């Protein structure tokens, strides 16, 4: 049983989970952060007025669970350079 790709079922080495892949870069675009940090602050419920052509719920309203993530602005305090090597 179980998805064998999520082995071994051991505790995470840290409480903050690592980002192991950032979006592929495109140098022509302006400078942007790829990621942000927040704190999970509970869930709630919303009513969404759906506009989805083809759906049985097109032009109709649905109720959705949502998560709220508390995100005060982050402070930039450093920069690190990386060089690619045969390793």
């Amino acid at each position: 049983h179980g998805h064998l790709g999520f082995l071994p079922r051991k505790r995470a080495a840290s409480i903050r989970a690592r980002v192991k892949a950032f979006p592929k870069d495109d140098r022509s675009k302006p400078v942007a952060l790829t990621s942000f940090l927040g704190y999970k602050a509970g869930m709630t419920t919303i009513v969404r007025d759906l506009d989805r052509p083809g759906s049985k719920f097109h032009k109709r309203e649905v109720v959705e669970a949502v998560t709220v993530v508390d995100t005060p602005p982050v402070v930039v305090v450093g920069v690190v350079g990386y060089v690619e090597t045969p390793r």
């Binding site: 083809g54 049985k56 097109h58 032009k59 109709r60």
Partner: protein
């Protein structure tokens, strides 16, 4: 002006549309093929409204009315009532009814001057019908069938009832309605005829499976062509006898 179409490959035009002489109500689902099928014949002459009733598509079965007014069930929401009101002109009354028989299209078989209703509906909704639609209400079972709106398609010109109707029932209903009546089928032998086809005094729309004999009978009874009178039974009789 008898035409054939489908809503999402379904032959039940009366389920998904409502046709009167001054407006048309079309289910919102899918693409615009059904709406444009109505609009190609009707033109910009009368309003054609994409509408939803209680989140559903079965609006010819949940809704009742005629050229004068429109009746919606208690399940209709305020947003849908407002949408209908903003779409239709003020000359159309719009009323929401607190009736336990919510399927108004099923329980009311009406036209511009007389309504045939389910026997067990209450005096409150009968009075609402007589007030908002300007018709006279008659409690009658067509061949002993509940859901007169489902089993009969009616117009100011004529009427198509399900074939099982006895001759005495046909005579009595014809006298009560003052329109000629024919027992017949639609969509290749479907008994449910009012729910299988929409019709008004100048246009009729039925499923793509409506055969040529059935379509001719429908066009004859509903008097769509000016030249043809109610008397063409004597000229379609050979075809009908060979068919049955």
């Amino acid at each position: 002006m008898a035409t054939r179409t489908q809503f999402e490959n379904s032959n039940e035009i009366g389920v998904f549309s409502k046709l009167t002489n001054t407006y048309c109500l079309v289910a919102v689902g899918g693409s615009e093929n059904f709406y444009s099928a109505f609009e190609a014949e009707l033109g910009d002459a009368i309003p054609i409204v994409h509408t939803t009733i209680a989140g559903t598509r079965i609006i010819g079965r949940m809704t009742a009315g005629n050229r004068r007014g429109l009746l919606v069930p208690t399940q209709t929401t305020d947003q849908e009532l407002q949408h209908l009101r903003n779409s239709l002109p003020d000359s159309v009354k719009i009323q929401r009814v607190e009736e336990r028989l919510s399927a108004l299209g099923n329980v009311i078989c009406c036209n511009d001057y007389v309504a045939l209703v389910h026997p067990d509906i209450d005096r409150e909704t009968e009075e609402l019908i007589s007030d908002v639609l300007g018709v006279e209400v008659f409690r009658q079972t067509i061949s002993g069938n509940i859901l007169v709106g489902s089993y009969c398609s009616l117009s100011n010109q004529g009427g198509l009832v399900h074939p099982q109707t006895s001759v005495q029932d046909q005579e009595e209903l014809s006298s009560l309605l003052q329109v000629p009546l024919v027992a017949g089928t639609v969509n290749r032998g479907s008994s449910v005829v009012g729910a299988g086809m929409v019709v008004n005094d100048y246009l009729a729309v039925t499923g793509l499976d409506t055969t040529a004999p059935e379509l001719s009978v429908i066009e004859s009874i509903f008097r769509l062509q000016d030249a043809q009178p109610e008397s063409i039974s004597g000229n379609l009789r050979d075809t009908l006898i060979e068919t049955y």
